Amino acid sequence: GSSGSSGTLAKSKGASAGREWTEQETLLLLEALEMYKDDWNKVSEHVGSRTQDECILHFLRLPIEDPYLENSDSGPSSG
């Protein structure tokens, strides 16, 4: 089924337990993406609790870049 150019899709997560990227991690990934942009081996190390593979994936997950749009707030300290 094809409607538009972009591959429309939705992700439903709630019960499936496993791994999760925390706002903290998300940033780390970027920090390295600047220095070890290509050097994945290091990237996986920069983060801390992530492997080369995982890192690569996460990278292809983040939302689209916007010119001007108020993003969510850090909020409380999620435990």
From Swiss-Prot:
It is found in: Nucleus; Cytoplasm. Phosphorylated on undefined residues at the G2/M transition by ERK1 and other kinases. This may contribute to cell cycle specific inactivation of remodeling complexes containing the phosphorylated protein. Residues 16-67 form the SANT domain. Expressed in brain, heart, muscle, placenta, lung, liver, muscle, kidney and pancreas. It comes from Homo sapiens (Human). It is linked to Hydrocephalus, congenital, 5: A form of congenital hydrocephalus, a disease characterized by in utero onset of enlarged ventricles due to accumulation of ventricular cerebrospinal fluid. HYC5 is an autosomal dominant form with incomplete penetrance and variable expressivity, associated with aqueductal stenosis apparent from birth. Some patients may have neurodevelopmental delay, seizures, or structural brain abnormalities. Component of the multiprotein chromatin-remodeling complexes SWI/SNF: SWI/SNF-A (BAF), SWI/SNF-B (PBAF) and related complexes. The canonical complex contains a catalytic subunit (either SMARCA4/BRG1/BAF190A or SMARCA2/BRM/BAF190B) and at least SMARCE1, ACTL6A/BAF53, SMARCC1/BAF155, SMARCC2/BAF170, and SMARCB1/SNF5/BAF47. Other subunits specific to each of the complexes may also be present permitting several possible combinations developmentally and tissue specific. This is SWI/SNF complex subunit SMARCC1. Belongs to the SMARCC family. Involved in transcriptional activation and repression of select genes by chromatin remodeling (alteration of DNA-nucleosome topology). Component of SWI/SNF chromatin remodeling complexes that carry out key enzymatic activities, changing chromatin structure by altering DNA-histone contacts within a nucleosome in an ATP-dependent manner. May stimulate the ATPase activity of the catalytic subunit of the complex. Belongs to the neural progenitors-specific chromatin remodeling complex (npBAF complex) and the neuron-specific chromatin remodeling complex (nBAF complex).
